[PDB]
Amino acid sequence: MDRIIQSPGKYIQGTGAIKRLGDYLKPLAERWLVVGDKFVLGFAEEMLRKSLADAGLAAEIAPFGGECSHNEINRLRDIAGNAKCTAVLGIGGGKTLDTAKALAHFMNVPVAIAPTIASTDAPCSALSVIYTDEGEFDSYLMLPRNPNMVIVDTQIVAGAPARLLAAGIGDALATWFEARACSRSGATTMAGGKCTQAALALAELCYNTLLEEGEKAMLAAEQHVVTPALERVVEANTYLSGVGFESGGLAAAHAIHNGMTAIPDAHHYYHGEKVAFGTLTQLVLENAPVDEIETVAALCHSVGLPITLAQLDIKGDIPTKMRLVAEAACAEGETIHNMPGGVDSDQVYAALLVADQYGQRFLQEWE
Amino acid sequence: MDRIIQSPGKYIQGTGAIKRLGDYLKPLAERWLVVGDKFVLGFAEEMLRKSLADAGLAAEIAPFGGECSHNEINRLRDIAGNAKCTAVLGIGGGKTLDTAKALAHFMNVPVAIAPTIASTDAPCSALSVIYTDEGEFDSYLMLPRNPNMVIVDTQIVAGAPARLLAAGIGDALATWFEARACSRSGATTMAGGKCTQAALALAELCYNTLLEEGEKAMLAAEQHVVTPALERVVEANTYLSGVGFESGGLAAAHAIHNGMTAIPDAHHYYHGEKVAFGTLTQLVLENAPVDEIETVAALCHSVGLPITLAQLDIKGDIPTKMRLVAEAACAEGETIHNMPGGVDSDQVYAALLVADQYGQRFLQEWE
Amino acid sequence: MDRIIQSPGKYIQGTGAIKRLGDYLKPLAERWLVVGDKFVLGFAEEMLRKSLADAGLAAEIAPFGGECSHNEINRLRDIAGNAKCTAVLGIGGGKTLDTAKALAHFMNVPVAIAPTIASTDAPCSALSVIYTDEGEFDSYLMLPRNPNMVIVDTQIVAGAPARLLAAGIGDALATWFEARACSRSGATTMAGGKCTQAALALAELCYNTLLEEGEKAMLAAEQHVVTPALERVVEANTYLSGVGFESGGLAAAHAIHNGMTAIPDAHHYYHGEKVAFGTLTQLVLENAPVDEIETVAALCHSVGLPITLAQLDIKGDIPTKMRLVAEAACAEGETIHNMPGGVDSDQVYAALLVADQYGQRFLQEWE
Amino acid sequence: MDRIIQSPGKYIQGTGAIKRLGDYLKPLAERWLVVGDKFVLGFAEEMLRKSLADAGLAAEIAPFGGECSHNEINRLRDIAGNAKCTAVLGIGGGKTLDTAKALAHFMNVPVAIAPTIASTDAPCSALSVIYTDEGEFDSYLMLPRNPNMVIVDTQIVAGAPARLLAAGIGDALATWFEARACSRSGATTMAGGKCTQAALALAELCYNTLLEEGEKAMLAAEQHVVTPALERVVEANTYLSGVGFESGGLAAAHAIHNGMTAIPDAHHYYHGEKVAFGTLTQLVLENAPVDEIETVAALCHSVGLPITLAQLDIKGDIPTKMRLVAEAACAEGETIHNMPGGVDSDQVYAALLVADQYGQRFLQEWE
Amino acid sequence: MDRIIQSPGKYIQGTGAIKRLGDYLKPLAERWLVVGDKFVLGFAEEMLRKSLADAGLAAEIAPFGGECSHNEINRLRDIAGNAKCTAVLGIGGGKTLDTAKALAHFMNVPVAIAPTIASTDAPCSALSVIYTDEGEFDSYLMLPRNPNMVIVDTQIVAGAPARLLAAGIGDALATWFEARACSRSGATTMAGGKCTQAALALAELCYNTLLEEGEKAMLAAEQHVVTPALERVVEANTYLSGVGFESGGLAAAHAIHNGMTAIPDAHHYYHGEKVAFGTLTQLVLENAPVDEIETVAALCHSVGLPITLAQLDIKGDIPTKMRLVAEAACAEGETIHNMPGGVDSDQVYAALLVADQYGQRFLQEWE
Ligand SMILES: [Zn+2]
Ligand SMILES: [Zn+2]
Ligand SMILES: [Zn+2]
Ligand SMILES: [Zn+2]
Ligand SMILES: [Zn+2]
Structure with missing residues (x-):
């Protein structure tokens, strides 16, 4: 079948990029709905307003309700209509950015996406995860277009807790191994075709950037400062990992992550932390x-990602819990069937137990 | 400054992709202006109409006037308005595709771009070259967005004259060397920032794909059939070379190409053929x-690209002609000043003469 | 699914091995039907009879009818019954050896197989190709067991025309590439499971033996003498290539060989000569x-195998002929669908034309 | 622009070289002002006088005042004039050698320079740092010529405290990294042009000599004996590091060293010790x-150079202190702007904190 | 013994450097005797006068007599005294530059040296070869100082016949092999000590630059244009080869060059052309x-240097002629005794004949 790669139209990254938002957004649209939660607007709203105002753009600030839900999307669409907004700017973390993308689709307007953390592979993707108002997962919204613009202010990112940068490393770490698996099996990607050479190259660059820069970047993150290593890792966590998973393909790591919702144990851990163990x-x-x-x-281990079940607070009654995780990871429609040669729950169960044993040995040898 | 990469929203490539245009275009818009010249519509219009009609889309066929000019853009905008078109499909070669991109910008509608040849790095870029109705160059139109969609039917491409695939190889060959030059000098790209790691990786993949697949692909091109090597080279000539030059940066090769319009000699040669010598x-x-x-x-030499001035029909009075080319390549605003350490017309003149001498020696040794 | 490797029970190879047949066959059975054509018995029957008689075994000599047909199998079964034979020895080339294997299956007795040439991968396999009395292909007989014993007298083999050893090299050359293809795609082998590591290792050893020893062996073959290089190649052509294709898997090369029966042109060429081009x-x-x-x-080229269509006397009207070959190679049930990612007749047609162009260029460069 | 390398006219190094001073100085001039402090003349004056007297040269011994100041230069010029000196010999450490170079320039006479320690890159350079009589820094005196002669008695050097040899290693360690930075950025060197291949090669030899010989040399230094390793390191610390910085270029390490005068903390540490951390x-x-x-x-770490702020006694209120260091390192005219791509105080601040964190981790892992 | 390296005080190289002579010379002296022959002043005197005049310097132009002789030195000293010159500028080729160096020594003034060709290793050295007025060799004048300044205008050099650049390559080619020989044997250099690591590194850089850049540079030289390759080779031929031979050491190649004056045959060949064969x-x-x-x-061979006796027009009666060359090369005081393990005329004779045989075979194989 056809080979397809998708990308945001323009990916921008640098220290202080928020100050230049007005100039970057102007060629797209003149009147912007700005969606962010109270914490993000608390530190960014003044800079935001100045940049847009100085560029001659209008901004309607809309504090985010907290969930990417159909009700929240309709609430923001109503707010935007009163200000005759012609575009949407989402600024903040995943739930905010998913909402902005979904909202822009239903209004059929450009969307600009400004992550304030680099903790997941999602910002660049043509995907919104819909939740209920209560925060329960509802559905996957496949969007027909990636965001028009993604703008990453790395000095804002460097101010976030370092654990979130390491979580982004966990998400991005899966990118190469899942895309390679899909390339070997000829699986269809979320872009809707087979993997391109471009996406494979970007996914492999993601992995090598993490190997070469991950530890250097964590040092900067823990000091809340920007170095080139942190810049390369932020790009890897956001653009390379984003295009890599969407146009390169998902496989066992993603499906094992989703399978862990079949048990309550790891609820305190981030997407990328669970994905790290799923990659192992x-x-x-x-x-x-x-x-x-x-x-x-x-x-x-060098960036604090878990390599054992215990490091995800998955303890006690491990055979029962891993059977639950394995069956869910192998459900109809799950990306684990993109693995070469097919995989069943027995093989996943075995891999989960052996990977945990392997991380336990690694940790022991490391002392 | 910020690092920026731009891309078309969705790049699709495969044999028979034209037959699936309707399904690919439907999520973007329902009513399409279809711009192509009489030759391209001669072989593609029936397939085009069936794919769009079967998907429930409307198509207004608009035979292309031949030049990407302000008059032609206004003519097509008038035609599109009568059919209430909400998007533009350009199908064919460079002038058609530039027109479709410029038209879609002035109507503010999505654009889909279907190259029928893989001879230049232009289709994916946020650029239209404007000409007069007479075909004289007028101006560069920097577009605020890359095309929404690029769809490359590799079986259509394989039907084109093989010389056009080799010309695309010439264009794509410059990509790595110009992006590397800009990375070393810290020059600003046409994306408006410094080079990203992503664009550098794509540009280097472009070069290596040409080294590994170029000769294998030419064999298929000359037989007018599709093999994986031809598929990889078509991707390299179109997506990798497109994003590579726009987000990776232009340098001496591009400026030397433009300098050759200061003399009449090479008028019969393609953009990529002149760029090959400019890269040397x-x-x-x-x-x-x-x-x-x-x-x-x-x-x-293995794909027939020129490596001497004589192979571009540049003969006789070479010192005078190369001085003309060198001065024009070094004019204010030309990308040759992106070269590390700066370059003046004396250095370019010297390089032109020495590169020609080197190609002459290569050809001789090759017998 | 399960991974399965099949093998003959005992593979014996060495100079003068025919003289030791009696001692090798005695532990299997006491009374042997000996099937060979008039030419093979002309040079081997005296040695055969002495070896079996000296070991205290009975031999009923049955000159072979020439075709592996149901009538011939029934004729030999009737002959064997009159002498109360309890085992079958086939000696000679492919048709004789297929008959002996099929006969032994229908009598349910041990079979020993003595190839006098090393020109195909068939002797060790649990397969008989059935033909009509007229020599037209009838069916594939999958046998439930490989031969009990294969005995290769390399001094007899060295006496055969050298072209037959090179043809065996052509057959064996495909072994690694077809088994690797099946390993990558997870195709089922004729052994009935997925490929084992053992079969993959034997197939890769086959290929490397041909690279290291093929030219050294051809020199001995042309002089009709036995050197260790010829011994290694005979093993590669017979045991390694036999187990390699049956337990490693068949793919495009085998299917392209079969497709050439869709045209009359290459009728004068051996199985392994056509398989060489099918591998390219x-x-x-x-x-x-x-x-x-x-x-x-x-x-x-170093052993005289064809790398162009013309070297198989396939000339004139090549597009028509290769379309015929490509459609037949891709028929339902053909092993070309074991190729990773699937293949259709358009891709095979393209590959045939490009491979021929590539061999033409190789031959030209070689002068 | 032009590429320029500068060097002292003659660099002499060996055990007992002081004994041969007379023969080395005779071809330059007959009557020498000898400037050294009381400690240096205490051990060297007798040998000095004998060597010069035996060669038929006159020596006027002038005990050094301690500061390289305009008053001290005028005092020594007055002393020299009374003895009709026609050349200047400076013997000892940096302040003495800077004074001798400046004095020789203002008298317009040859200067010979005899370092008794190998602790800085300065002796060979066409530079004198002027101080007030009080020891406060006044200005940089760019000299129009490098010293005519530099004579390094390695047995005198081996008698100095080993910490001074390690400090010289710290100074010399920066040489390659600063020259490479300037080569990449095309910065102008203190020689007044762009970097030559010769200076780059000498700077890279400096670095590799330190890697190969630094630890071997420290063992000799601590035993106060001369081995070839110590001889190679003394050459690296003096000639290679001298020509390397002056003709290869200064960058961030030098500017960060100067920035540490914006705080009082590291006053007890040598130039080369601070430069080591500036290189990290x-x-x-x-x-x-x-x-x-x-x-x-x-x-x-292997020679005791600091790799953390604490090892420079920079402790407490680190964000404030490093902001002070970073702003001063980035002042107008500082060599940090020779770094490729430009650098601002925010980037230096970040690098300082991350380098310190990295040295802290290194020290910890080392136990 | 001591290790010693000597260098000119300042080596300057670049296109148009002659135009900046005034600014470069001003810090050394105010009133310059300018020595050059009629041909060199024919193209350079106007530029020379403007540069010096614009810098406020005086110039007394003194057309060179043609020989570096005691009479010529006295003639120019008389001329200089009438204009109260305080420094000497030599511009042109070897005889002019040797005269300027010798003159500056006898006047005890700074000397600046401006080679207009890069054909020998001499310009930077503390050496003048004295000849009679008739052009017969008289003596070697060892100077106590290297030139204060060497200024190489590479655009002037590129205008010279390309054969002179190749001759410089021949001179520079010996540098590494002679310095390595002296390092292995511990011979004394002309700097008067044993070889330093610095000189060895520069000599090895010389050789590698010729290997990497020699052919690229010849192409520019033949086109009379400046490229970076030509710039690197000019540096190699002048600075690296100069310091390399003087501070690295001379050996068999130099002595064999001198031995060829024992026969008349090679009189039409340049120093560097004979040195190339002496290196072989x-x-x-x-x-x-x-x-x-x-x-x-x-x-x-790639730059046209001779590798056979016949390519030096040494033909006929080769045993007699090479005995003459070998005896002269081994005379008392010749640098061939710097070869490790000592060498006598029998060994040199043998080497001459075998090297010629080897070049003859090389030329034959090359066709
Ligand atoms: Zn994820
Ligand atoms: Zn182009
Ligand atoms: Zn076969
Ligand atoms: Zn320093
Ligand atoms: Zn020489």
């Missing part, structure tokens, strides 16, 4: 060479 | 190691 | 790196 | 690969 | 590995 499990499943498993586990 | 000249200018110059010249 | 076509289809295609073509 | 900070700033940062930190 | 002979003498001899001969 995937490496067992594909029988990756010891050197490769070793390198991934070392990378994870 | 750039390698002299940056004093590339002999192995690297050797590899580029061998690649060029 | 497969390398195009999987877009093998230039170095790998180069190495295979060089190996073929 | 530069490596962060240029995002050097982890292996390279690792190698430099290991080299520093 | 040295490689035989030290039994260099075949790869190394091969590489040097290939380098020589």
Whole structure:
């Protein structure tokens, strides 16, 4: 079938980029709905307003309700209509950015996306996860277009808790291994075709950037300052990992992440932290060479990502819990069937237990 | 400053992709102006109409006037308005595709771009070159967005004259060397920022794909059939070279190409054929190691790209002509000043003469 | 699914091995039907009788009818019953050996197989090709067991025309590439499961033996003498290529060989000669790196195997003929669908034309 | 612009070289002002006088006042005039040698320079740092010529405290990284042109000599004996590092050293000790690969050079102090702007904090 | 003994450097004797006068007599005294530059040296070769100082006949092999000590620059234009080869060059052309590995340097002539005794004949 790659129209990254938002947004639209939660607007609203006003743009500030829900999208659409907004700016973290993307689709207007953290692969993607008002997961909204613009102010990102940058590393770490799996199996990506060479190259660059820059970047993150290593990792966590998963393909790591909602244990952990362990499990499943498993586990441990079930607070009654995770990971429609040669719940169960044993040995040897 | 990468929203490539245009275009818009010249519509209009009609889309066919001019854009805008078109599909070669992009911008509608040849790096870019009705160059139109969609039917491409695929190789060959030059000098790209790692990786993938697949692809092109090598080269000539030049940066090769309009001699040669020699000249200018110059010249010769002035029909009174080319390449605003350490017309003149001498020696040794 | 490897029970190879047949066959059975054509018995019957008689075994000599047909199998079964034979020895080339294997199955007795040439991968396999009495192909007989014993007298083999050893090299050359293709795609082998590591290792050893020993062995073959290089190649052509195709898997090369019966042109060429070109076509289809295609073509040319259509006397009206070959190679049930990612007749047609162009260029450069 | 390298006219190094001063100085001039402090003349004056007297040269011994000041230069010029001196010999450490160079310039006579320690890159350079009589920094005196002669008695050097040899290693360690930075950015050197290949080669030899010989040399230094390793390091600390910085270029390490005078904390540490940490900070700033940062930190630690702020007695209120250091390092005219792509105080501040964190981790892992 | 390196005080190289002579010379002296022959002043005197006049310097132009003789030095000293010159500028080729250096020594004034060709290793050295007025060799004048300043206008150099640049390559080619020989044997250099690491590194850089850039530079030289390759080779031929021979050491190649004055045959060839063959002979003498001899001969042949006696017009009666050359090369005081392990005329004779045989074979294989 056809090979397809999707991307946001324009990805912008640099220190102080928020100050230049007005100039970047002007060619797209003149009147912007600005969606962000109270915490994000607390530190960004003044800069936001000045940049847009100085560029001659209008801004209607709309504090975010907290959930990406159909009710919240309709509430913001009503607000935007009163100010005759012709575009949407989402600023903040994942739920805010998903809402802005979904809202812009239903209004059929450009969307600009300003992540204030680099903790997940989602901002660049043509996807919104819909939740109920209560925060329960409802559905996946496949969008027909990626965001027009993604603008990453790396000095804002460097101010976030360092754990969120490491979580982004966990999300981005899966990118190469899942895209490679899909390339080998010929699976269809979320872009709707087979993997391109471009997406594979970006996914492999993602992985190598994390290997070369991940530890250097964590040092900057913990000091809340911007160095080139942090800049490269932020790009890897956002653009490379975004295009990599969407146009490169998802596989076992993503499906194992979703399977962990079949148990309550890991609720306090971030998407990327669970994905890190899911990647180690995937490496067992594909029988990756010891050197490769070793390198991934070392990378994870060096930035504090979990490599054992216990590091995700998954403890006690492990056979029962991993059977639950394995069956859910292998449900109809889950991306684990993109693995070469097919996989069933018995193989995933085995991989989960062996990956945990392997992380336990790694941690022990490390002392 | 900020680092920026731009891309078309969705790049689609495969054999028979034209048959699936309707399904690919439907999520963007319902009523399409279809712009193509009489030759392209001669072979594609029936397939086009069936795909769009079967998807429930409307199509207003508008035979292209031949020039990307303000008059032609206004003519097509008038035609589109009568059919209440809400999007533009350009199908064919460069002038058609530039017109469709410019038209879609002035109507503020989505644009889909269907190249029927893979001969230049332009289709994916946020650029239209405006000409007079007479075909004289008028201006560069910087567009605020890349095309929403680029759809490359590789079986249509394989039907084109093989010389056009080799010309695309010439255009794409410059991509890595110009982006690397801009990365080293910190020049601003046409995306408006400094080069990203993503664009550099795509530009380097472009070059390596040409080295690994260029000769295999030419064999398929000359037989007018699709093999994976031809698929990889078409991607390299279109997506990788497009994003690579726009977000990676232009330098001496592009400026030397433009300088050759200061003389009449090479008028019968394609953009990519002149760019191939401009890349060799750039390698002299940056004093590339002999192995690297050797590899580029061998690649060029293996697909029939020129590596001497005589192969561009530039003969006789070479000192005068190359002085004219060198002065024009170094004019204010030309991308040759993106070269590390700066360059003046004396250095370009020297490089032109030495590159030609080097291609002459290469050709001789090759017998 | 399960991973399965099949093998003959005992594979014996060495100079003068025919003289030791009696001692090798005695532990299996006491009374042997000996099937061979008049030419083979002309040089081997005296040695045969002495070896079996000296070991205390009975031999009923049954001159072979020439075709592996149901009538011939019934004729030999009747002959064997009159002598109360309890085992079958086939000695000679493919049709004789297929008959002996099929006969032994229908009598349910041990079979010993003594190839006098090393020209195909068939002797060790659990397969008999059934023909009509007229020599037209009838059906594939999948046998439930591989031969009990295969005995290769390399001094007899060295006496055969050298072209037959090179043909065996052509058959064996496909082994690694087809088994690798099936390993990558997870196709089912004729052993009835997925590929084992053992079969993959044997198939890769086959290929490397041909690269290292093929030319050394041809020199011995042309002089009709036995050297260790010829011994290694005979093993590669017989045991390694036999287990490799049956337990490693068939793919495009085998299917392209079968497709050439859709045209009359190559009737004068051996199975392995057509398979050599089918392997080159497969390398195009999987877009093998230039170095790998180069190495295979060089190996073929160094032993006289064809790398162009013209070297198979396939000339004139090539588009029509290759369309016929491509459609037949892609019929339902053909092993070309074991190729990773699936293949259709358009892709095979393209590969055939490009492989021929590539062999034409290779031959030209070689002068 | 032009490429320029400067050097002292003659650089002499060996055990007992002071004994041969007379023969080395005779071809330059007959009557020498000898400037050294009371400690240096205490051990060297007798040898000095004998060597010059035996060669038929006159010597006027002038005990050094302690500061390289305009008053001290005028005092020594008056002393020299009474003895009709026609040349100047400075013997000892930096302040003495700067005075001798400045004095020789104002008298317009040859100067010979005899360092008794190898602790800084200054002796060979066409530079004198002028201070007030009080020891406060006054100005940089760019000299029009390098010293005519530099004579390094390595047995005198080996008698100095080993900490001074390690400090010289710290100064020399910056040489390659600063010259490479200036080569990449095309910055102007203190020689007044762009970097030559000669200076780059000498700077890279400096670095590799320190890697290969630094630890071997420290063992000799601590035992106060001369081995070839110590001889190579003395050359590296004096000639290679001297020509390397002056003709290769200064960058972030030098500017960060100067920035530390914006705080009082590190006053007890030598120039080369502060430059070692400034080099580590530069490596962060240029995002050097982890292996390279690792190698430099290991080299520093192996000879006792600081790799943390605390090892420079910079403790407490680190954000305030590093902001002060960063702003001063980025002042107009500072060599940090020779870094490729430009650098501002925010980037230096970040690099300082991250380099310190990195040295802290290195020290911890080392136990 | 001591290790010593000597250098000119300031080496300047770039296109148009002559135009900046005034600014470069001003800090040294105010009133300049300018010595050059009628041809050099014919193209340079106007530029010379403008640069010096614009800088406020006086110039007394003194057309050169043609020979570096005691009479010529006295003639120019008389001329200079009438204009109260306080410095000497020599501009042109070797005889002019030797005269200027010798003159400046006898006047005890600064000397600046401006080679207009890059054909020998001499300009930077503290050496003048004295001849009679008739042009017969008289003596070697060892100078106590290297020139204060060497200024190489590479655009003037590029205008010279390309054969002179290749001759400079021949001179510079010996540099590494002679310095390495002296380092291995511990011979004393003309700097008066043993070899330093700095000089060895510069000599090895010389050789590698010629290998990497020699052919690229010749192309520019033949086109009379400046490229970076030509700039690197000019530096190699002048600074690196100058300091390399003087501070690195001379050996067999230099002595064999001098030995060829024992016969009349090669009088039409340049110093560097004879030195190229002397280097090949040295490689035989030290039994260099075949790869190394091969590489040097290939380098020589690629720029037109001789690798046979016949290419130096040394033909007929070769045993007699080479005995004469060998005895002279081994005379008392000749640098051939710097070769490791000592060498006598029998060994040199053998090496000469074998080197010639080797060049003859090389030329033959090259066709
Ligand atoms: Zn994820
Ligand atoms: Zn182009
Ligand atoms: Zn076969
Ligand atoms: Zn310093
Ligand atoms: Zn010489």
